[PDB]
Amino acid sequence: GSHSMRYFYTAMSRPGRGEPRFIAVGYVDDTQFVRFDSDAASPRMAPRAPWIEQEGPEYWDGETRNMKASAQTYRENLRIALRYYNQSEAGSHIIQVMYGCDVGPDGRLLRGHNQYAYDGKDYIALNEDLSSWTAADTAAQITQRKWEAARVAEQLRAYLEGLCVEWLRRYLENGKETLQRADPPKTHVTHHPISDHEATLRCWALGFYPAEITLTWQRDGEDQTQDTELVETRPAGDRTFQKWAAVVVPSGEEQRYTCHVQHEGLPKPLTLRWEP
């Protein structure tokens, strides 16, 4: 199908406790493949998936140098943002960055992304045109005017349409046994009375990849959206994900409820019911 590569940087200041911590992780789809942590005993870009391990020392050395340089730049940006928001030096603050590219089945660029946050709120984002910016507030407009003067968007557009797509295509090939395999969910429904006149039906999906999934309960053929408890999709730790959806139903009406499952790994959507 279509695929994405994303890097996520977090830069956290901690006045009185040294220089800000910088952590970067990289993902292809829902598979993490690299990490960097400035607090490690010896910080370097390190592999986190088997298919990236074959890259040579020039790759690891270059990525490590780049992550150290980025960590220095983001430490400076945290100082800058403090001034832009008139904040004191006593507090801890966080910059986050996410960027990367999405490609379709043929490997052509579908869209690029470069977005920044400050203290968990939007700060500035490159727009879908890869040539203009949306700033969330007047502080971010100061950055916007600097990046417009320096033509930063042109440099990002060149990365996103070029190296980002090229390297993602390379990773997809080197990791094709896993990055290009969808594992469908194993599904079942459980039933537990909560009282003499109500029972919970819970529809489970386990062992699936990628993480995107839709689990819905219908009663008599109609979606029970407002009435369904859905937990967040969660990682099993072996690459796959898990999710469930639950509905509280009147005793004796269990067979009016059906759970519908949609996942990339299934040829067609699944319908299941409680089977006593």
């Binding site: 870009m45 340089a69 600097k146 980002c164």
Partner: peptide, 9 residues
């Protein structure tokens, strides 16, 4: 592969 531009605010 990460981007090399890290830009100052």
């Amino acid at each position: 592969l990460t981007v090399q531009v890290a830009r100052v605010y």
